[PDB]
Design a protein around this nucleic acid. Structure first.
Ligand SMILES: Nc1nc2c(ncn2[C@@H]2O[C@H](COP(=O)(O)OP(=O)(O)OP(=O)(O)O)[C@@H](O)[C@H]2O)c(=O)[nH]1
Ligand SMILES: [Mg+2]
Ligand SMILES: [Mg+2]
Ligand SMILES: [Mg+2]
Ligand SMILES: [Mg+2]
Ligand SMILES: [Mg+2]
Ligand SMILES: [Mg+2]
Ligand SMILES: [Mg+2]
Ligand SMILES: [Mg+2]
Ligand SMILES: [Mg+2]
Ligand SMILES: [Mg+2]
Ligand SMILES: [Mg+2]
Ligand SMILES: [Mg+2]
Ligand SMILES: [Mg+2]
Ligand SMILES: [Mg+2]
Ligand SMILES: [Mg+2]
Ligand SMILES: [Mg+2]
Ligand SMILES: [Mg+2]
Ligand SMILES: [Mg+2]
Ligand SMILES: [Mg+2]
Ligand SMILES: [Mg+2]
Ligand SMILES: [Mg+2]
Ligand SMILES: [Mg+2]
Ligand SMILES: [Mg+2]
Ligand SMILES: [Mg+2]
Ligand SMILES: [Mg+2]
Ligand SMILES: [Mg+2]
Ligand SMILES: [Mg+2]
Ligand SMILES: [Mg+2]
Lengths: 166, 101, 275, 94, 140, 97, 148
RNA sequence: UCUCUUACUUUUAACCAGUGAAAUUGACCUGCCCGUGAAGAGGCGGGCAUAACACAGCAAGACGAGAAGACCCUAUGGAGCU
RNA sequence: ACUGAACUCCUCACACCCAAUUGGACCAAUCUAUCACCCUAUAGAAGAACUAAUGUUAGUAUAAGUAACAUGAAAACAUUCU
RNA sequence: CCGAGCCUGGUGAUAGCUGGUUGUCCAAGAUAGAAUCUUAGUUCAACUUUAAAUUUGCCCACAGAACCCUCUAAAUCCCCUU
RNA sequence: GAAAUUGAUGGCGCAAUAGAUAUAGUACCGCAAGGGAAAGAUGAAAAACCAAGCAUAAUAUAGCAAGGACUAACCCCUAUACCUUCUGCAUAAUGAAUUAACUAGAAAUAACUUUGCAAGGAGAGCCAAAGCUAAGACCCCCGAAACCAGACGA
């Protein structure tokens, strides 16, 4: 097994110079061996990607999926450790930069079928990962306007060369 | 081959020319010499006293590996060969014309 | 476990390669890396450029003031290249001015100055030094060498060449290594100008020619999103130049640029430089 | 619609094929070349009696060369230098 | 397991390196990657003939375009240049059409000149004086 | 993944231990000792292949003939079956006949 | 293949031929071994050819390092910053000589597919063709069907 | 039963939540018509069509999955019976 | 008249496109004898090389988050009701 | 899972039948029939491969190779020269 | 397929799909005989980057998914997966989901090449009208329905 996500919290950056932008705090948290399918967990992860901590908690509190409660607990733990250990000043000033689900260690069981035949059940387990970044959530990527899209087309037109000649 | 050439041009000849790099050469088979307002055409080759094209052997190299692959379905016929073709890059230094028309 | 060592060794080497690619090492000056000898490298520099540099002068040119300060600080815990760089810069400017004025007698003094500034600028000189290995032989207190220090070292090398071989050989060196940098470049790519129509009007007034008249020579797809406008400047009902553009204003500006190029003798089809 | 029964070009009911002006011209060109060949073959220089034996010597010498090549096949020579040169694989510096 | 293969990683990589840019499992699975890579190499080998053929086709198309601009058809231009004894090939002719329009106009004028000289000779069949541009420089 | 991620432990071979140093000694015992002993008498190993060589069938036949009575029950059964199979293979199967 | 490999255009390091030819190769590091059959040819090259090559090419610094090696190598460093490492493992004197001469005559530019066998910074002398070339002009610039 | 099918209830079903198989699977970026062809094309030729994606149905095709066809023939292949 | 092959010419180089079968030159890795000592050389050996056997074992996919499975109701969770 | 049980052993049964038969490169390489419980196979021949010895090999000028049968095909065999 | 007769100190082994089936004849399977597995890896002390599959990161018209290319991923042009079998397969004939590991040419006679010695060769035997001695090279894997013997089963 691999446990690099936990280790990611132990990297210490060199002290920043006075004339340097303040580095946003990054907190890596995870929960391992959740009795839940990673495919089902991925939907919740994708839902909360890119949102503020408070918005993600609010969305999860009112979601009927089992994984929602687990993700809410993980997010609360991440917030607590960010405030206590990673010198994050405000609880709410955190956004989910990364949220993914990974395959866990799964157990194999037998499903009995009708004619002495069988299938191999998989007691599925999944991991859950979160990175919380300090600061307001990055603004959503604006849809590209007609002006920008036509500008791209004209750039493509200008990029044309006389191919296969001097 | 026939190359359309001008001063400061680079030409990639697909073989070794048996010349040390940085050595000056005269390209003797000039079919056409042209300017903004006039062009002179050979029948089929222009005169030495009319045109002098000079080049310099800038580089001697081997081409990037070329794959020669032969395959026939359902015959256990598969063959592969890697070939690198010698090459020489020449820089055309000058194209000089003389009043001998 | 499979008995054997050679496959494992190959895999270890490949893992090292992948590790290096994923985490590239910080750049280090070639002096630190193995297989380096300063005297041999500098002699090879001279022979490669095919010039009889005096070794002491070349070493003085390569050594910079910042290197001296750093070395003194380290000693706490040498003649710089200032004069050589000044001499080389002055000679390069004067010789490039001579070349450019001889080649383009109609070019204005401002144009010649701008071309000389382009040729002796940080970008061109830095590129030439980097590809001539001046950086490797450069003694500085930080790596990679900053463009200013690299330019100073390159001009110090030129000054050392002047003091060793003479003005003629130095002029040949400049012609070979800086004048060549204007090949394929465009006049206003090297000399940035604003209001080319104004410049053209001024030049024509100095030459005693009637003010140019813009005239739409050709047009295509005027009402579309991709128009073409060939606008020609006519003096005394005579075409001095014509330029294409997307809009009429852009076409007129480009036609003014073409007219300026023709007047200054820096046309694309001009006589190639004679080396 | 417009099916040719079976395989085209082989069966009793084949796809019709029509000669183009191009094909006719090509065949006529080849026919002209062969007519010129007939003309140039219709004028022998020597007669059979005149040619009899005029190349016998050269043909015999050529076959003698072939026979010599065939009968000279023998294993190649072997030299002590070749055998002793293998000792150089462990040639080292000092 | 007296003797076992220990290089199979590198043996697989020698093939997968050329399949990394494929789509789907053909860029990951050796069983599929090897087939796709063999096909790609065969295509690359066979594509040189097509490269030359398409280069000549492109040159012919461009020469046709320029000759039509000057009012001549490609067969006329090529045949009459040959008759003028100018041995410019199609690559060079297309390059001239693109980058030296005035030179190509001169060449088209020469081709039309020779074409009209040939027409005049055919019309006035006989021992009339040969066209000025129809004279052929003999070599020995 | 069939390749180890670490270099195997260095393998040191003593080229000058007693066995290697004295290897080959007395191989010329016969020619250099009035032929009192044949070099094949220097071969230490199974009794049925001391100074003798043959294919698998011949080796099995010799083993059964020389030590078959002293073999274990299942080992002797295996040897008999191997002899049978090798007989059939060598006398009835093959490209050349 | 071309689509599976990077490509570049024909070019020179600093317009290598306009003013004067400059040998792009600057450094040649020969890692050789006193013992080991792999470097027999390298040893013979160092004995009989390296001196001649060095004097023939005075602009190239050659560093012959004799250390324990199973695979003797030659590292060629070019003015442009390119490094080409070639194995001279079990190569005869002639093979090593040819390889070294090829490195000397070769520029530092990458050995990849070259898109065009030629490179011109001034492809046009008479004016690059545009749609309005070979098109006559009309009186007062009147487009077709224009009334006035 | 049918002419001639309709209405409702339960299960099933569809959506939400938990748990979670099976055959199958060369790779697929997996269209229609005509022609071709190892003799019945999604992949070939000529045309036509063609932003990308889910969800629910259908069973015309993928010579669909399933069982190395039980029919038929062969094997100096078996076995049962007379 | 032109277009048109891997035919032919052209510049350089050439052993470098037939199934079964056959001849030959090299060679990955392993061990052994001597070398070598950031991966090797000369030889001797052999369980000596896998895109394919409805191949064996193990892992993980597709089908699929699909087919299927489950807890009568309220409540003080004492109890009551259907 | 009984036209004759199941397990173990002989047993790696045998199979003219099906399937599979793993590094690189070059070269030569498609060709009459006979016999056979034999036509799904094999031996001989023919062809093919390799190495070796030797000298004629192929193409082919006249001349020449049947009457039955009154006439009658493309051709063939043989064959110096070349 | 004889007999007379002759005389007679470890590893160019495996190293957890290997080597014993074996961590065990245990677990499990079968009424019974009987069949029969899998696997573990820290450190001196614990009293201290790489398979497949996915995710980061769904997708754009068109097509064995690539090649020629190109400024440009696609758009343009060219291109009927592989293996086996066959007269002939893109074939709508077989096999294959994919990754890792394992998985299949054994040898005599006579020849050929290379040595040694030579009317003799060979370390008894055998061969010899240049032979003889030695070496090199030289022939696969899975699969039946079956048959028989002895046990186990109402
Ligand atoms: N070939 C072989 N030699 C063995 C074996 N076991 C022991 N030996 C040899 O027996 C010799 C003596 O063994 P040691 O253990 O040293 O001494 P030991 O205990 O007196 O020996 P034994 O009397 O044989 O029990 C050595 O030469 C060993 O190599 C074996 O299984 N095979
Ligand atoms: Mg599953
Ligand atoms: Mg048909
Ligand atoms: Mg559900
Ligand atoms: Mg059809
Ligand atoms: Mg649907
Ligand atoms: Mg249905
Ligand atoms: Mg299909
Ligand atoms: Mg079916
Ligand atoms: Mg069947
Ligand atoms: Mg029946
Ligand atoms: Mg029978
Ligand atoms: Mg052609
Ligand atoms: Mg094997
Ligand atoms: Mg494998
Ligand atoms: Mg398989
Ligand atoms: Mg799923
Ligand atoms: Mg479904
Ligand atoms: Mg359901
Ligand atoms: Mg039963
Ligand atoms: Mg069998
Ligand atoms: Mg062949
Ligand atoms: Mg006896
Ligand atoms: Mg085991
Ligand atoms: Mg992976
Ligand atoms: Mg199929
Ligand atoms: Mg079949
Ligand atoms: Mg299938
Ligand atoms: Mg009872």
């Amino acid at each position: 097994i691999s446990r690099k996500w936990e280790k990611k919290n132990k990297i210490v950056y060199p002290p920043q110079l006075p004339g340097e932008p303040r580095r946003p705090a990054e907190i890596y948290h995870c929960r391992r061996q959740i009795k839940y399918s990673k495919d089902k967990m991925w939907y919740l992860a994708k839902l909360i990607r890119g949102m503020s901590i408070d918005q993600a908690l609010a969305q999860l509190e009112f979601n009927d999926k089992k994984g929602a409660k687990i993700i809410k607990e993980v997010l609360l733990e991440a917030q607590d450790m960010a405030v206590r250990d990673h010198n994050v000043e405000f609880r709410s000033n955190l956004y989910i930069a990364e949220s993914t689900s990974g395959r866990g260690q799964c157990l194999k069981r037998i499903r009995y079928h009708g004619r002495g035949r069988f299938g191999i059940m998989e007691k599925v387990y999944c991991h859950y990962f979160v990175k919380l970044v300090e600061g307001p959530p990055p603004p959503p990527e604006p849809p590209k306007t007609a002006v920008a899209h036509a500008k791209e087309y004209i750039q493509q037109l200008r990029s044309r060369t006389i191919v296969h000649t001097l | 081959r026939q190359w359309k050439v001008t001063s400061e041009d680079l030409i990639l000849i697909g073989n070794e020319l048996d010349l040390a790099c940085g050595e000056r050469i005269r390209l003797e088979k000039v079919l056409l010499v042209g300017a903004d307002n006039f062009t002179l055409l050979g029948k089929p080759l222009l005169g030495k006293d009319l045109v002098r094209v000079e080049a310099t052997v800038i580089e001697k190299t081997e081409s990037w590996p070329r794959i020669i692959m032969r395959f026939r379905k359902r015959k256990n016929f598969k063959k592969k060969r890697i070939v690198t073709t010698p090459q020489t890059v020449l820089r055309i230094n000058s194209i000089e014309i003389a009043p001998c028309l | 476990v499979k008995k054997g060592f050679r496959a494992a060794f190959r895999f270890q080497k490949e893992l090292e390669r992948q590790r290096l690619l994923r985490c590239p090492p910080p750049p280090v000056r070639r002096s630190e890396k193995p297989n380096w000898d300063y005297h041999a490298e500098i002699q090879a520099f001279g022979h490669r450029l095919q010039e009889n540099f005096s070794l002491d002068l070349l070493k003085t040119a390569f050594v910079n003031s910042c290197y001296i300060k750093s070395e003194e600080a380290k000693r706490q815990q040498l003649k710089s290249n200032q004069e050589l760089s000044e001499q080389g810069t002055s000679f390069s400017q004067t010789c490039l001015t001579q070349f450019l004025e001889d080649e383009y007698p109609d070019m204005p003094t401002e144009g010649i100055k701008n071309l000389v500034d382009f040729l002796t600028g940080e970008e061109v000189v830095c590129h030439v030094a980097r590809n001539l290995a001046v950086e490797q032989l450069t003694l500085s207190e930080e790596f990679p060498v900053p463009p200013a220090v690299l330019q100073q070292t390159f001009f110090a090398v030129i000054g050392a060449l002047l003091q060793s071989s003479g003005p003629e050989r130095t002029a040949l060196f400049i012609r070979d290594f800086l004048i060549t940098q204007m090949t394929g470049k465009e006049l206003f790519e090297m000399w940035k100008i604003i209001n080319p129509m104004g410049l053209l009007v001024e030049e024509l007034k100095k030459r005693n020619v009637s003010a140019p008249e813009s005239r739409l020579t050709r047009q295509s797809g005027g009402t579309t999103a991709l128009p073409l406008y060939f606008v020609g400047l006519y003096c005394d009902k005579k075409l001095i130049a014509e330029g294409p553009g997307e809009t009429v204003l852009v076409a007129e500006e480009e036609a003014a640029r073409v007219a300026l190029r023709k007047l200054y003798g820096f046309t694309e089809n001009r006589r190639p430089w004679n080396y | 619609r417009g099916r040719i029964p079976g395989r085209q070009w082989i069966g009793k009911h084949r796809r019709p094929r029509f000669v183009s002006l191009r094909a006719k011209q090509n065949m006529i060109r080849r026919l002209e070349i062969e007519a010129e060949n007939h003309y140039w073959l219709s004028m022998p220089y020597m007669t059979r009696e005149q040619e009899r034996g005029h190349a016998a010597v050269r043909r015999r010498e050529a076959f003698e060369a072939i026979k010599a090549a065939a009968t000279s096949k023998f294993p190649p020579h072997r030299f002590i230098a070749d055998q002793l040169d293998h000792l150089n694989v462990t040639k080292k510096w000092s | 397991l007296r003797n076992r293969v220990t290089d199979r990683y590198f043996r697989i990589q020698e093939v997968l390196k050329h399949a990394r840019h494929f789509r789907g499992r053909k860029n990951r699975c050796y069983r599929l990657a090897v087939r796709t890579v063999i096909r790609a190499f065969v295509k690359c080998t066979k594509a040189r003939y097509l490269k030359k053929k398409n280069m000549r086709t492109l040159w012919i198309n461009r020469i046709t375009a320029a000759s039509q601009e000057h009012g001549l058809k490609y067969p006329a231009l090529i045949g009459n240049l040959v008759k003028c004894q100018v041995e410019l090939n199609r690559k060079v002719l297309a390059d001239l059409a693109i980058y030296e329009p005035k030179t190509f106009k001169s060449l088209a004028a020469l081709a039309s000149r020779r074409r009209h000289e040939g027409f005049a000779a055919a019309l006035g069949d006989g021992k009339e004086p040969e066209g000025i541009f129809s004279r052929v420089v003999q070599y020995h | 993944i069939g390749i180890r991620l670490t270099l195997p432990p260095p393998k040191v071979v003593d080229r000058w231990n007693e066995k290697r140093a004295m290897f080959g000694v007395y191989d010329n015992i016969g020619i250099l000792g009035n032929f009192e002993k044949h070099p094949k008498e220097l071969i230490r190993g199974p009794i049925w292949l001391r100074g003798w060589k043959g294919n698998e069938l011949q080796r099995c036949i010799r083993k059964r003939k020389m030590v078959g009575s002293r073999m274990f029950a299942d080992d002797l059964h295996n040897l008999n079956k191997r002899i049978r199979y090798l007989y059939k293979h060598f006398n009835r199967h093959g490209k050349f006949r | 293949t071309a689509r599976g490999t990077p490509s570049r255009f024909l070019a020179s390091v600093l317009h290598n031929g306009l003013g004067r030819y400059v040998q792009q190769l600057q450094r040649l590091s020969f890692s050789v071994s006193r013992d080991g059959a792999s470097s027999r040819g390298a040893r013979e090259f160092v004995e009989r050819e390296v001196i001649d090559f060095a004097r023939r090419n005075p602009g190239v610094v050659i560093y012959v390092n004799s250390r324990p090696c199973c695979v003797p190598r030659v590292v060629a460093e070019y003015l442009n910053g390119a490094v080409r490492e070639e194995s001279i493992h079990c190569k005869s004197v002639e093979e090593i000589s040819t390889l070294v001469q090829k490195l000397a005559d070769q520029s530092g530019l990458d050995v990849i597919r070259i898109r065009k066998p030629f490179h011109t910074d001034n492809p046009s002398i008479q004016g690059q063709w545009h749609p309005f070339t070979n098109k006559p002009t009309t009186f007062r610039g009147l487009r077709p069907r224009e009334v006035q």
